[PDB]
């Protein structure tokens, strides 16, 4: 049932991804509902995006047939990889970047209620020259709001990246390490409070231009980050802690950045203990425009010659109790996490611990050897 | 030339990358002579994964004495007229770094945090903090039960900080310094962001590890650092550390053998020298024995059952300097100016020397993974 995780209009869409048909990772385009092996046009997705800039026609690759006819299976139904065809993460050589704390109104309010409320929002809004829900990060209004927050003793390093001029942008994981649709993702076995983060992921080419978008799960360990923000990397970057997919949807007549900007991202978590968590949260509340976030990651002071993928952040808060009252959500082995939006489909993974997930073994040199052996270089 | 190589470099085994005119080439320097080992393995990462530690690497193609090669630093060859160019000695490795592994750095991190990145507040905060702490941080082993009891004391003192958690708690601070293939090497320009007004070099020793997590050798490093970004918010760590040309490793990795081992890394005296167009001079020394966690312990936290690195990784071990010498205004401390020359040196590894400019004036990073792949393929090396 490969159709259940594609966008409802996928046959009218342009998808860009990676599939192993049995010889190794192959960049594919899906157009008219049919898969095209484009490896002879460009041997990687990063190379394809660099070879064909926006507005250029991408030629046809070799026909692999209707995507729904490929026997693709997820790990929880095919634990041993018996399937003849394996869908992969749609990234290969791109750097994996991630923004965080991009929904500021959420952050601000959560601090005002931790203190309580209606009375605190008066002064902050009057000093800002405006309602908090209109906060513009990096503005002069945000600057006066910062100084008012400092004067109240409510300021924090998190509000700095919420409303200051610089967004929080970090490296989510090493190149070639992402999980894809239908893979296991890993939380550290020594983390006790962790959660998914349902996100939209931008595809950017080697010229810093936004080409398309996919779904992402930024697997997150709250107990590490909460002990120290200097453990951010350890909270975000472990074996199988990144999932992107199922495909990147490229911008065309049917789909553009404006569709990303108004995308409703849904999250569902299902456990064997019969725990269920559901929730939806709209990209229109993001406090920094996706094109602005791309322009902070890429510019005169940082380039990315193979391109980069960019997680745009989330406003989902893992506060729903599971077993321990007041301590919020945490994963258990075998949880199924679905991240979905209508124009991009469904990214679904199974949760295990980083030591039980398959280790990351296929790195840059493994790809090079594989592509060399197939005559694709 | 010999000015930037180990004292005993002709007796050492050095591993690095040189562009002779056709693209990046993994080289070994033995007996003072350069070997092109590209036909043995096409990258440094591949070479470390093909030969385990202790295994003798067979001889490559002789390229003559190293001192006979016309290698020139950017401050003497701005347009790159030299026929040969020395590169960073990493290629496919992930660039990993440890933080606050020396007490002098830990204190300056708490200072810039409480200053919220404002250099004009550092003197006042340093005067308070340096006396109340100091003699405290190195009084415990990080991650021990003792360290947990010191944490409870400092919390009661009102002195606790998220930086002390990674300085003495069970988890070291490890982060990604920059993207694969983005490092600068000896003789390159490094970059501080043009919008940073409180910044510094960070001399460090850099380990080379293979794809099995084994420590293989060591180089020198400059982890160019923006204090005003990181002090404003620790969530800006990546932006404080990872910008165009903000990473320098070199001149070569020295591989472990009978002339050099991890024990030499553990006792290495490291020297920092900064010189500017304004005739500012800083010169200082510190020793690796002051590190709070053994280098093998740090590599063991970076690599294990919960994070692999199939192409290997480089690991900055943490800076042992935090420059606070006043440059222009009494009490205002240090920051870089364009044209600064930064020398990191220790006798067993040589000299890593770079010229500082702003990230936007440094040449952009254009040679990434695809460029390397295409270059190697065109040379028949795959
Ligand atoms: C938090 C980091 C700035 C600390 C660091 O890089 C170091 O101490 O070497
Ligand atoms: Mg995020
Ligand atoms: Mg450092």
PDB file of N, CA, C and O in Angstrom, chain A residues 183-189 194 219 239-240 331-335 349-358, chain B residues 306:
ATOM      1  N   UNK A 183      11.568   3.644   7.981  1.00  0.00           N
ATOM      2  CA  UNK A 183      12.754   3.235   8.722  1.00  0.00           C
ATOM      3  C   UNK A 183      12.503   3.314  10.223  1.00  0.00           C
ATOM      4  O   UNK A 183      11.574   3.977  10.690  1.00  0.00           O
ATOM      5  N   UNK A 184      13.367   2.647  10.984  1.00  0.00           N
ATOM      6  CA  UNK A 184      13.441   2.903  12.415  1.00  0.00           C
ATOM      7  C   UNK A 184      14.186   4.205  12.661  1.00  0.00           C
ATOM      8  O   UNK A 184      15.163   4.515  11.974  1.00  0.00           O
ATOM      9  N   UNK A 185      13.701   4.981  13.624  1.00  0.00           N
ATOM     10  CA  UNK A 185      14.444   6.106  14.168  1.00  0.00           C
ATOM     11  C   UNK A 185      14.867   5.740  15.590  1.00  0.00           C
ATOM     12  O   UNK A 185      14.259   4.891  16.250  1.00  0.00           O
ATOM     13  N   UNK A 186      15.922   6.394  16.066  1.00  0.00           N
ATOM     14  CA  UNK A 186      16.461   6.043  17.365  1.00  0.00           C
ATOM     15  C   UNK A 186      16.470   7.165  18.381  1.00  0.00           C
ATOM     16  O   UNK A 186      16.873   8.292  18.070  1.00  0.00           O
ATOM     17  N   UNK A 187      16.007   6.872  19.595  1.00  0.00           N
ATOM     18  CA  UNK A 187      16.248   7.717  20.760  1.00  0.00           C
ATOM     19  C   UNK A 187      17.333   7.043  21.585  1.00  0.00           C
ATOM     20  O   UNK A 187      17.406   5.811  21.635  1.00  0.00           O
ATOM     21  N   UNK A 188      18.192   7.841  22.217  1.00  0.00           N
ATOM     22  CA  UNK A 188      19.256   7.266  23.028  1.00  0.00           C
ATOM     23  C   UNK A 188      18.673   6.414  24.153  1.00  0.00           C
ATOM     24  O   UNK A 188      17.647   6.758  24.745  1.00  0.00           O
ATOM     25  N   UNK A 189      19.329   5.290  24.448  1.00  0.00           N
ATOM     26  CA  UNK A 189      18.812   4.423  25.502  1.00  0.00           C
ATOM     27  C   UNK A 189      18.940   5.057  26.877  1.00  0.00           C
ATOM     28  O   UNK A 189      18.253   4.629  27.809  1.00  0.00           O
ATOM     29  N   UNK A 194      11.856  12.252  25.721  1.00  0.00           N
ATOM     30  CA  UNK A 194      12.166  12.472  24.319  1.00  0.00           C
ATOM     31  C   UNK A 194      10.854  12.492  23.548  1.00  0.00           C
ATOM     32  O   UNK A 194       9.811  12.073  24.059  1.00  0.00           O
ATOM     33  N   UNK A 219      13.914  14.092  15.748  1.00  0.00           N
ATOM     34  CA  UNK A 219      13.865  13.339  17.002  1.00  0.00           C
ATOM     35  C   UNK A 219      14.691  14.058  18.062  1.00  0.00           C
ATOM     36  O   UNK A 219      15.850  14.432  17.828  1.00  0.00           O
ATOM     37  N   UNK A 239      22.607   8.032  16.290  1.00  0.00           N
ATOM     38  CA  UNK A 239      22.313   7.075  15.228  1.00  0.00           C
ATOM     39  C   UNK A 239      20.814   7.033  14.944  1.00  0.00           C
ATOM     40  O   UNK A 239      20.013   6.833  15.859  1.00  0.00           O
ATOM     41  N   UNK A 240      20.443   7.273  13.680  1.00  0.00           N
ATOM     42  CA  UNK A 240      19.058   7.190  13.211  1.00  0.00           C
ATOM     43  C   UNK A 240      18.141   8.223  13.877  1.00  0.00           C
ATOM     44  O   UNK A 240      16.940   7.993  14.036  1.00  0.00           O
ATOM     45  N   UNK A 331       9.026   8.425  24.563  1.00  0.00           N
ATOM     46  CA  UNK A 331       8.843   7.287  23.675  1.00  0.00           C
ATOM     47  C   UNK A 331       9.041   5.966  24.410  1.00  0.00           C
ATOM     48  O   UNK A 331       9.721   5.883  25.433  1.00  0.00           O
ATOM     49  N   UNK A 332       8.418   4.927  23.865  1.00  0.00           N
ATOM     50  CA  UNK A 332       8.723   3.552  24.209  1.00  0.00           C
ATOM     51  C   UNK A 332       9.054   2.811  22.926  1.00  0.00           C
ATOM     52  O   UNK A 332       8.600   3.193  21.846  1.00  0.00           O
ATOM     53  N   UNK A 333       9.881   1.771  23.048  1.00  0.00           N
ATOM     54  CA  UNK A 333      10.291   1.017  21.872  1.00  0.00           C
ATOM     55  C   UNK A 333       9.062   0.510  21.139  1.00  0.00           C
ATOM     56  O   UNK A 333       8.104   0.018  21.752  1.00  0.00           O
ATOM     57  N   UNK A 334       9.074   0.656  19.815  1.00  0.00           N
ATOM     58  CA  UNK A 334       7.968   0.224  18.990  1.00  0.00           C
ATOM     59  C   UNK A 334       6.893   1.261  18.732  1.00  0.00           C
ATOM     60  O   UNK A 334       5.890   0.930  18.084  1.00  0.00           O
ATOM     61  N   UNK A 335       7.053   2.491  19.228  1.00  0.00           N
ATOM     62  CA  UNK A 335       6.108   3.553  18.898  1.00  0.00           C
ATOM     63  C   UNK A 335       6.128   3.828  17.398  1.00  0.00           C
ATOM     64  O   UNK A 335       7.180   3.794  16.759  1.00  0.00           O
ATOM     65  N   UNK A 349       7.612   6.393  10.858  1.00  0.00           N
ATOM     66  CA  UNK A 349       8.758   5.651  11.352  1.00  0.00           C
ATOM     67  C   UNK A 349       8.337   4.858  12.580  1.00  0.00           C
ATOM     68  O   UNK A 349       7.281   5.099  13.171  1.00  0.00           O
ATOM     69  N   UNK A 350       9.186   3.903  12.953  1.00  0.00           N
ATOM     70  CA  UNK A 350       9.065   3.131  14.182  1.00  0.00           C
ATOM     71  C   UNK A 350      10.217   3.514  15.104  1.00  0.00           C
ATOM     72  O   UNK A 350      11.359   3.642  14.654  1.00  0.00           O
ATOM     73  N   UNK A 351       9.924   3.697  16.388  1.00  0.00           N
ATOM     74  CA  UNK A 351      10.928   4.163  17.343  1.00  0.00           C
ATOM     75  C   UNK A 351      11.607   2.966  17.993  1.00  0.00           C
ATOM     76  O   UNK A 351      10.942   2.022  18.437  1.00  0.00           O
ATOM     77  N   UNK A 352      12.936   2.998  18.037  1.00  0.00           N
ATOM     78  CA  UNK A 352      13.711   2.072  18.852  1.00  0.00           C
ATOM     79  C   UNK A 352      14.841   2.872  19.489  1.00  0.00           C
ATOM     80  O   UNK A 352      14.885   4.098  19.384  1.00  0.00           O
ATOM     81  N   UNK A 353      15.766   2.199  20.159  1.00  0.00           N
ATOM     82  CA  UNK A 353      16.870   2.956  20.727  1.00  0.00           C
ATOM     83  C   UNK A 353      18.080   2.939  19.792  1.00  0.00           C
ATOM     84  O   UNK A 353      18.250   2.030  18.975  1.00  0.00           O
ATOM     85  N   UNK A 354      18.920   3.978  19.917  1.00  0.00           N
ATOM     86  CA  UNK A 354      20.010   4.175  18.959  1.00  0.00           C
ATOM     87  C   UNK A 354      20.946   2.977  18.900  1.00  0.00           C
ATOM     88  O   UNK A 354      21.516   2.686  17.839  1.00  0.00           O
ATOM     89  N   UNK A 355      21.134   2.281  20.025  1.00  0.00           N
ATOM     90  CA  UNK A 355      21.966   1.084  20.024  1.00  0.00           C
ATOM     91  C   UNK A 355      21.293  -0.120  19.369  1.00  0.00           C
ATOM     92  O   UNK A 355      21.991  -1.055  18.957  1.00  0.00           O
ATOM     93  N   UNK A 356      19.967  -0.143  19.283  1.00  0.00           N
ATOM     94  CA  UNK A 356      19.290  -1.256  18.635  1.00  0.00           C
ATOM     95  C   UNK A 356      19.012  -0.997  17.163  1.00  0.00           C
ATOM     96  O   UNK A 356      18.865  -1.956  16.396  1.00  0.00           O
ATOM     97  N   UNK A 357      18.912   0.263  16.749  1.00  0.00           N
ATOM     98  CA  UNK A 357      18.791   0.541  15.327  1.00  0.00           C
ATOM     99  C   UNK A 357      20.040   0.049  14.606  1.00  0.00           C
ATOM    100  O   UNK A 357      21.120  -0.057  15.199  1.00  0.00           O
ATOM    101  N   UNK A 358      19.882  -0.280  13.325  1.00  0.00           N
ATOM    102  CA  UNK A 358      21.042  -0.602  12.510  1.00  0.00           C
ATOM    103  C   UNK A 358      22.041   0.553  12.562  1.00  0.00           C
ATOM    104  O   UNK A 358      21.645   1.729  12.518  1.00  0.00           O
TER     105      UNK A 358
ATOM    106  N   UNK B 306      25.955   4.360  19.902  1.00  0.00           N
ATOM    107  CA  UNK B 306      24.889   5.283  19.578  1.00  0.00           C
ATOM    108  C   UNK B 306      25.300   6.362  18.588  1.00  0.00           C
ATOM    109  O   UNK B 306      24.483   7.232  18.268  1.00  0.00           O
TER     110      UNK B 306
END
